Design a protein around this ligand. Structure first.
Ligand SMILES: CCCCCCCCCCCCCCCCCC(=O)OC[C@H](CO[C@@H]1O[C@H](CO[C@H]2O[C@H](CO)[C@H](O)[C@H](O)[C@H]2O)[C@H](O)[C@H](O)[C@H]1O)OC(=O)CCCCCCCCCCCCCCCCC
Ligand code: CLA
Ligand code: CLA
Ligand SMILES: CCCCCCCCCCCCCCCCCC(=O)OC[C@H](CO[C@@H]1O[C@H](CO)[C@H](O)[C@H](O)[C@H]1O)OC(=O)CCCCCCCCCCCCCCCCC
Ligand SMILES: CCCCCCCCCCCCCCCCCC(=O)OC[C@H](CO[C@@H]1O[C@H](CO)[C@H](O)[C@H](O)[C@H]1O)OC(=O)CCCCCCCCCCCCCCCCC
Ligand SMILES: CCCCCCCCCCCCCCCCCC(=O)OC[C@H](CO[C@@H]1O[C@H](CO)[C@H](O)[C@H](O)[C@H]1O)OC(=O)CCCCCCCCCCCCCCCCC
Ligand SMILES: CCCCCCCCCCCCCCCCCC(=O)OC[C@H](CO[C@@H]1O[C@H](CO)[C@H](O)[C@H](O)[C@H]1O)OC(=O)CCCCCCCCCCCCCCCCC
Ligand SMILES: CCCCCCCCCCCCCCCCCC(=O)OC[C@H](CO[C@@H]1O[C@H](CO)[C@H](O)[C@H](O)[C@H]1O)OC(=O)CCCCCCCCCCCCCCCCC
Ligand SMILES: CCCCCCCCCCCCCCCC(=O)OC[C@H](COC1O[C@H](CS(=O)(=O)O)[C@@H](O)[C@H](O)[C@H]1O)OC(=O)CCCCCCCCCCCCCCC
Ligand SMILES: CCCCCCCCCCCCO[C@@H]1O[C@H](CO)[C@@H](O[C@H]2O[C@H](CO)[C@@H](O)[C@H](O)[C@H]2O)[C@H](O)[C@H]1O
Ligand SMILES: CCCCCCCCCCCCO[C@@H]1O[C@H](CO)[C@@H](O[C@H]2O[C@H](CO)[C@@H](O)[C@H](O)[C@H]2O)[C@H](O)[C@H]1O
Ligand SMILES: CCNc1nc(NC(C)(C)C)nc(SC)n1
Ligand code: OEC
Ligand SMILES: [Ca+2]
Ligand SMILES: [Cl-]
Lengths: 51, 34, 243, 137, 335, 32, 35, 97, 37, 51, 51, 51, 34
């Protein structure tokens, strides 16, 4: 889980604002668990990827 | 509305504190004899 | 032999008796002669509290905890018949005794975890065919874990189950659906598991000794919140006699 | 609003017959009741066992009936449990045990009758107060 | 060096110190710093205390949900009673904070130091050539802290029954006290309020009489206070004009003209009254309570005719019947 | 937030105490 | 923990000695006149 | 739904008659000759499946059985309620005068 | 103690008070929006 | 998933970088238990500076 | 309508105590359910003090 | 409705507190409607009354 | 916890305002020649 967590833009220091005060938690919230890896596919079975 | 709770006090002390500063001086200057 | 004064204040009073390194024998069972336990005794050594894996179910383990109350943990004076069974096994059946003690332990966070460490209505059993009680002759069974606080207990605001207030009288016109859980007291009753595994016998006097491990739930506080899982390790001492 | 002889007329025995106490006996009982009872029966209750009081009705359902002079008197001589199935003179003051409860030595049949009369007269005056406890103080 | 120790003793005892650290001070200064430092931390961060020994923790610190008015330092456990509970008596601090250990560390050091504080109020007076006795005035308020923090607990069998260290915690001590002892109906407490009421009264009398009979030496638009210089020879008010007015308010012989007799009375009254109040709490610490006039006046038939004394008993029963909800298992409250 | 406010004022009173005891106007005799 | 006890004890002894050996040091002497 | 088992019990037989499986021992003091001896036996002798099962307590003298028969109309019986039986609350539920 | 000889008096004229306040107030009019965010 | 840097902790990290990783209350930055930080726990450090 | 399940009956009984039973919107103002006084009350307190 | 509303202790100026600030609505809430008159009866049909 | 939102600012201005008052005076007194 720890490893997956670093791969979330919500921990990227480059996101945010000057008057968006407080901990990172007042934002997206206190992380509880990893929902899991999401694989998208289309009717043909082809695997798609989210930009 | 859905504002910041500390906004009010942040704005209040931001105005009061330094204004209180200047004022303390001006009055102590103003009352210096001769 | 130590009179009362020879123990008072030493903390010695909260310690189940011990057998010496010698006593590693075996006691005989007549199977045609009723037997009873003149004195079962359980002394806690550790209290582990299984931690809630947060939302991320990752499998949780038991963790040590500090004993915030004091040396008041031991169960003593337990007694009942140790009937011999057809298959030659033995099952202990408790009748009465200081069979429970309210314990409170703290955790990493600082959280106090109160439990009613007990073995009420124990029903321990052994292996089939057990002519004589040798070292490590496992006893296993369940017991009942009654609510920590009894029916009459009142919360800081006067609300209670068998007695006390009906609601949050301090907030006369507040919505009640939200307060439901804390106004309506529930009395929890659950089962527990314990296993007394011998280590020292002494057929001479018929007094075995050993160590135990039991698991049970902690206080749910009149059902206001979920109970924590607890594991308890310690030592025990039993006095078997024909009677 | 007074203690008339009408109020001092309490049941003597089980067969309805009554007796009438006099303002002297009353006071005297009241004094004796304090001397050897209040200690534990102050105000009609029972400190060392709050389940049994001196309310006349309680004494009525006792066994044998202890809600009349004859009854209470027997009791003060040979005390029993509420079902009467057991004598308790050993842990309850009584005549047959004055060696153990000295306060009961002086006590003579005249005194026992007064104490008994007091118990039946009090609730007549005080009412609910006599039986109940602090709730009624 | 005239001799280190010889010197040390000259410093300690020196009357040239900004604050007179005396001989008594050598005990005071440390005990008082411990009491104070432990308190402040407790009051702010200590966790819940099982005051009644029934495993029902009462949190009384700011960080655990309290505010200045409610917050307090909770008394040691009842499981502990009168036993000594120094930190080195606990398997851990966690255990010590749960059984109310901080309470003892505080009351003992405070009471210790506050006594030496008295011992000091003597010493300095000696090193300065002034008459003693001031320290004897301070014996009253001290004799109270003692009564409320130690005598009462010794008497009652537990430190858990000592007055808590907090605002609301004190009201608790009072309300319950009243229920178990009916103090308002005790001679000693009454003498206490006479002394306190009286004190405040007299404090106002003197204060006004004097301030009102001050000799004019100030402008119409100048603080009337400046009319006094530190280190004056003569007096700053007309004690003869003061007496002149006050003697006419009531009547001459019922008025002071001797400043010394005035000031003795001024000190004597409150101190004597509080002495009795302190002896009240120290006396009701052995269960010799206030007058019990319950069901005294009864009528011609035997009916009970209530007096205000009875209306007071009901209010007391309410307190009795509700305090310590879960701590009692039997009929009589003998503890 | 409340805790901070309570402790702050307290901390301010103790500061006052200090200055009052150690930074008072030296009390001068006669001449004034 | 058994240590702290020791330390505390030492510490209290110091001060209590400083106290007795103090008034002992001819305290009556210390004062304005007659000594 | 969360309900106060006790306040609910008061809507059944318990609450109208002496419950042989729940009601506290002192309740037996309201009928002639049941208290000391019998009440102990009744309570001591676990739960009952029906009021009459009381008449079956081992040892009951012929007279006791007589008395019991007389007061049966004042008894009932309901599921054993833990909140009311735990803690030995049937021998002392913290109520006095 | 000797009267420390390194001290001078401090001054703030009326105009400075005004220039000062004008700055404090307007900064406050500029940042309050972001404080309340 | 909820480490100091998600909780707007600013000083707490500089204390771990050099050793102080425990609390007198029992917990620790790495997530262990039963550890004895001794006197130099975050509380300790904080205590020290105040004095 | 009529209600017979103890809890609901008691709920309303618990309300009858204040006189006529009403339906409040507690959300909006985020009410706490603790009685406050009317202007009549405040004006009275303020003027009795000032006086 | 208006008439029934005056018969509610929640409009009694004598209820309240010194630091129980705001309108009466921060208390019991904004009144929406009159639930109606409540009549309590017991098994026997007898009509009871709430003190 | 569940406290009053204005409590903080009410306490802040309750302390600041009058303290600032006294201070303005004391300093203007303190700096009067002679
Ligand atoms: C001026 C005042 C200076 C006070 C200095 C106190 C120094 C205390 C100390 O070194 O203390 C050490 C002890 C022990 O702390 C405990 O220490 C334990 C482990 O000890 C063991 O393990 C250690 C190594 O891990 C060592 O080997 C040690 O010797 C051994 O006994 C555990 O780690 C516990 O979790 C931990 O809490 O002090 C404690 O808890 C102390 C709590 C102190 C509060 C002090 C407040 C003081 C002034 C406040 C002013 C406010 C204004
Ligand atoms: C010096 C660097 C520094 C840094 C990097 C941080 C960083 C942090 N602090 Mg800390 N803090 C500091 C100093 C610092 N602090 C000091 C000195 C104090 C004492 C007051 C605090 C008290 C403090 C508290 C009480 C809390 C934090 C918290 C936090 C986190 C807050 C997130 C946030 O809301 O930022 C907000 C950043 C800003 C609002 C900056 C904007 C500045 C602008 C508005 C004004 C500039 C002034 C003026 C108008 C300029 C005009 C000039 C003129 C000439 C024109 C963050 C990691 C919070 C936390 O731990 O949450 C979990 C928390 O609760 N800090
Ligand atoms: C003179 C009488 C007066 C009266 C009767 C009212 C009455 C009312 N006002 Mg109004 N108000 C007044 C003057 C008055 N106001 C003034 C001068 C202002 C300008 C600031 C306001 C601004 C105002 C606002 C902005 C609002 C109200 C609102 C309200 C209602 C508020 C309910 C409440 O929370 O009270 C609370 C009462 C108190 C907190 C009083 C306690 C005072 C104590 C704490 C301190 C005393 C000072 C000091 C510590 C004493 C020490 C002395 C020393 C020598 C020892 C109420 C009907 C509210 C409303 O309309 O809600 C819908 C609202 O939002 N009022
Ligand atoms: C040339 C000019 C150069 C100018 C340089 C200017 C500034 C450099 C600033 C660096 C700042 C680091 C700031 C950290 C702030 C912070 O952490 O806030 C943290 C706080 C807390 O914020 C709260 O935190 C909570 C969790 O703890 C929750 O997340 C809440 O939702 C959140 O609001 O936010 C603020 O304080 C915003 C404050 C705006 C304050 C203006 C104050 C003015 C004070 C004036 C006088 C005061 C006298 C006392
Ligand atoms: C908030 C901001 C507070 C700012 C205060 C600035 C004070 C300047 C004083 C000054 O110049 O004094 C100058 C003066 C004396 O100044 C001299 O006076 C002489 C006549 O007596 C002559 O006029 C000399 O020319 C003149 O220099 O000294 C002092 O004021 C010492 C002041 C110490 C003030 C401490 C204030 C502490 C406030 C704490 C918390 C407040 C909230
Ligand atoms: C108690 C605890 C307190 C903790 C306090 C913590 C921090 C406090 C910080 C306080 C700071 C106070 C700073 C005051 C500075 C000051 O007064 O300077 C005053 C100075 C002094 O200027 C100098 O004054 C001297 C006499 O005192 C002499 O006259 C000098 O010759 C003169 O140069 O001001 C400046 O330099 C001002 C430049 C100002 C430019 C202003 C632009 C304003 C624009 C306003 C509105 C624009 C709107 C546009 C709309 C479109
Ligand atoms: C030997 C072992 C000794 C062990 C001691 C353990 C103390 C544990 C305290 C604890 O766990 O608290 C846990 C608590 C409670 O924390 C509160 O808990 C509440 C529920 O109980 C709520 O959730 C509150 O929101 C939450 O803040 O403590 C703290 O948050 C403490 C911050 C403490 C700062 C202490 C500074 C001490 C400084 C001393 C000298 C300074 C100079
Ligand atoms: C001898 C001594 C005699 C002393 C007499 C003292 C006081 C007499 C007071 C009469 C007061 C009437 C007060 C009305 C207050 C009011 O309505 O508040 C109304 C507010 C608003 O309150 C809010 O109202 C909202 C709806 O509009 C919601 O109901 C919110 O829940 C509610 O909190 O409450 C308060 O203000 C509480 C304030 C406590 C304030 C202390 C202020 C100290 C200010 C110091 C310096 C200020 C400089 C500017
Ligand atoms: C286990 C214990 C560990 C202890 C460690 C510390 C050892 C001792 C002292 C030094 C530490 C710093 C002390 C600060 C002193 C000071 O301010 O006074 C400085 C003055 C100036 O004189 C003076 O100062 C002179 C020198 S000079 O001005 O420094 O040059 C000096 O020669 C003279 O003797 C002296 O009296 O000293 C005194 O008058 C004696 C003061 C005694 C201390 C008071 C304690 C009272 C406690 C009260 C409780 C409430 C407060 C709670 C607060 C938290
Ligand atoms: C039941 C147990 C009884 C135990 C009794 C134990 C007694 C132990 C020591 C007794 C010591 C007497 O000790 C002696 O006292 C005199 C004062 O009288 C001190 O003399 C001291 O006082 C003068 C002032 O009078 C100072 O200027 C001098 O610097 C100081 O030392 C000696 O320095 C000290 O050595
Ligand atoms: C200003 C005055 C300050 C006074 C401070 C006084 C402090 C007094 C005592 C501190 C005692 C700490 O005592 C110590 O606590 C830790 C738990 O935290 C216990 O337990 C610790 O050591 C054992 C091994 O012994 C480890 O397996 C365990 O994981 C560890 O937590 C120790 O067995 C106990 O010896
Ligand atoms: C000097 C003014 N006279 C005077 N007299 C009195 N007499 C009583 C009895 C009140 C002490 N008091 C004072 S004020 C302490 N002053
Ligand atoms: Mn704090 Ca004197 Mn009421 Mn027994 Mn407990
Ligand atoms: Ca939790
Ligand atoms: Cl309690």
């Amino acid at each position: 889980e720890k490893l997956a967590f670093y791969d979330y833009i919500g921990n990227n220091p480059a996101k945010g604002g000057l008057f968006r005060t407080g901990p990172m938690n007042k934002g997206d919230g206190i992380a509880q668990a990893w929902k899991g890896h999401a694989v998208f596919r289309n009717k043909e079975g082809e695997e798609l990827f989210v930009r | 509305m859905e504002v910041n709770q500390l906004g009010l006090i942040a704005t209040a002390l931001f105005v009061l504190v330094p204004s209180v500063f200047l004022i303390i001086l001006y009055v102590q200057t103003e009352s210096q004899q001769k | 032999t130590l009179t009362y004064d020879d123990i008072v204040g030493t903390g010695l009073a909260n310690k189940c008796p011990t057998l010496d390194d010698t006593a590693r024998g075996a006691y005989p069972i007549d199977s045609s002669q009723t037997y009873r336990i003149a004195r079962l005794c359980l002394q806690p050594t550790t209290f582990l509290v299984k931690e809630e894996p947060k939302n991320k179910r990752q499998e949780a383990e038991f963790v040590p905890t500090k004993l915030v109350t004091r040396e008041t943990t031991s169960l003593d004076q337990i007694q009942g018949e140790l009937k011999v069974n057809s298959d030659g096994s033995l099952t202990f059946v408790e009748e009465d005794g200081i069979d429970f003690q309210p314990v409170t332990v703290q955790m990493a966070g600082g959280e106090r975890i109160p439990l009613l460490f007990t073995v009420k209505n124990l029903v321990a059993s052994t292996q089939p065919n057990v002519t004589s009680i040798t070292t490590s002759t496992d006893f296993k069974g369940e017991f009942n874990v009654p609510s920590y606080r009894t029916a009459n207990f009142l919360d800081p605001k006067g609300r209670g189950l068998a007695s006390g207030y009906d609601s949050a009288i301090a907030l006369p016109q507040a919505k009640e659906e939200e307060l439901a859980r804390a106004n309506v007291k529930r009395f929890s009753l659950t089962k527990g598991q314990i296993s007394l595994n011998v280590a020292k016998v002494d057929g001479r006097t018929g007094e075995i000794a050993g160590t135990f491990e039991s698991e049970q739930l902690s206080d749910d506080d009149m059902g206001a919140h979920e109970p924590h899982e607890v594991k308890i390790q310690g030592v025990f001492y039993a006095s078997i006699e024909p009677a | 609003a007074e203690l008339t002889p009408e109020v001092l007329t309490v049941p003597l025995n089980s067969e309805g017959k009554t007796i009438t106490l006099t303002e002297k006996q009353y006071l005297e009982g009241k004094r004796l009741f304090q001397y050897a009872c209040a200690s534990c029966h102050v105000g009609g209750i029972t400190k060392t066992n709050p389940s049994l009081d001196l309310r006349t009705e309680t004494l009525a359902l006792a066994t044998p009936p202890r809600d009349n002079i004859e009854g209470l008197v027997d009791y003060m001589k040979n005390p029993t449990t509420y079902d009467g199935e057991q004598e308790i003179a050993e842990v309850h003051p009584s005549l047959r045990s004055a060696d153990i409860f000295p306060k009961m030595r002086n006590l003579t049949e005249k005194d026992l009758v007064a104490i008994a009369g007091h118990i039946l007269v009090e609730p007549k005056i005080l009412g609910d107060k006599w039986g109940g406890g602090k709730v009624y103080y | 060096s005239a001799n280190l120790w010889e010197r040390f003793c000259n410093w300690v005892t020196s009357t040239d110190n900004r604050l007179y650290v005396g001989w008594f001070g050598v005990i005071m200064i440390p005990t008082l710093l411990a009491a104070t430092i432990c308190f402040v931390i407790a009051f702010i961060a200590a966790p819940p205390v099982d005051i009644d020994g029934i495993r029902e923790p009462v949190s009384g610190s700011l960080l655990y949900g309290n505010n200045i008015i409610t917050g307090a330092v909770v008394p040691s456990s009842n499981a502990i009673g009168l036993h000594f509970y120094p930190i080195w008596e606990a398997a851990s601090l966690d255990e010590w904070l749960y059984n109310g250990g901080p309470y003892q560390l505080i009351i003992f050091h405070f009471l210790l130091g506050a006594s030496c504080y008295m011992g000091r109020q003597w010493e300095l007076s000696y090193r300065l050539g002034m008459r003693p006795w001031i320290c004897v005035a301070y014996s009253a308020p001290l004799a109270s802290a003692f009564a409320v923090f130690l005598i009462y607990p010794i008497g009652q069998g537990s430190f858990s029954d000592g007055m808590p260290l907090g605002i609301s915690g004190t009201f608790n001590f009072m309300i319950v006290f009243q229920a178990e002892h009916n103090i308002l109906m005790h001679p000693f407490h009454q003498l206490g309020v006479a002394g306190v009421f009286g004190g405040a009264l007299f404090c106002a009398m003197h204060g006004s009489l004097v301030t009102s009979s001050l000799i004019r030496e100030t402008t119409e638009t100048e603080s009337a206070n400046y009319g006094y210089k530190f280190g004056q020879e003569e007096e700053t008010y007309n004690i003869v004009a003061a007496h002149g007015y006050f003697g006419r308010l009531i009547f001459q012989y019922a008025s002071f003209n001797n400043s010394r007799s005035l000031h003795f009375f001024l000190a004597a009254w409150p101190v004597v009254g509080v002495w009795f109040t302190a002896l009240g709490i120290s006396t009701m610490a052995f269960n010799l309570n206030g007058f019990n006039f319950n069901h005294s006046v009864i009528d011609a038939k035997g009916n009970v005719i209530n007096t205000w004394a009875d209306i007071i008993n009901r209010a007391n029963l309410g307190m009795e019947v509700m305090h310590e909800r879960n701590a009692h298992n039997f009929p009589l409250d003998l503890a | 937030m409340e805790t901070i406010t309570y402790v702050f004022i307290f901390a301010c009173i103790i500061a006052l105490f200090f200055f009052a005891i150690f930074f008072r106007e030296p009390p001068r005799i006669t001449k004034k | 923990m058994e240590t702290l006890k020791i330390t505390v004890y030492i510490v209290v002894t110091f001060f209590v000695l400083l106290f007795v050996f103090g008034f002992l040091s001819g305290d009556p002497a210390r004062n304005p006149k007659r000594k | 739904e969360l309900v106060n088992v006790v306040d609910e019990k008061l809507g059944t037989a318990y609450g109208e008659k002496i419950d042989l499986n729940n009601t506290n021992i002192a309740a037996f003091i309201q009928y002639r000759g049941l208290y000391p001896t019998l009440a102990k036996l009744i309570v001591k002798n676990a739960p009952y499946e029906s009021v009459e099962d009381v008449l079956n307590i081992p040892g009951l003298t012929e007279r006791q059985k007589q008395i019991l028969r007389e007061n049966l109309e004042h008894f009932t019986v309901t599921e054993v309620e833990t909140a009311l039986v735990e803690g030995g609350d049937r021998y002392n539920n913290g109520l006095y005068k | 103690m000797e009267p420390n000889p390194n001290r001078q008096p401090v001054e703030l004229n009326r105009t400075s008070l005004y220039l000062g306040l004008l700055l404090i107030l307007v900064l406050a009019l500029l940042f309050s929006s972001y404080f309340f965010n | 998933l909820n480490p100091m840097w998600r909780q707007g902790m600013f000083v707490l990290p500089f204390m771990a970088r050099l050793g102080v990783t425990g609390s007198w209350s029992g917990w620790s930055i790495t997530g262990e238990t039963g550890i004895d930080p001794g006197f130099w726990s975050f509380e300790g450090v904080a205590l020290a500076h105040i004095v | 309508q009529t209600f017979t399940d103890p809890p609901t009956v008691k709920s309303y009984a618990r309300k009858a105590i204040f006189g006529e039973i009403f339906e409040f919107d507690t959300e909006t103002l985020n009410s706490d359910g603790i009685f406050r006084t009317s202007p009549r009350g405040w004006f009275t307190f303020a003027h009795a003090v000032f006086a």
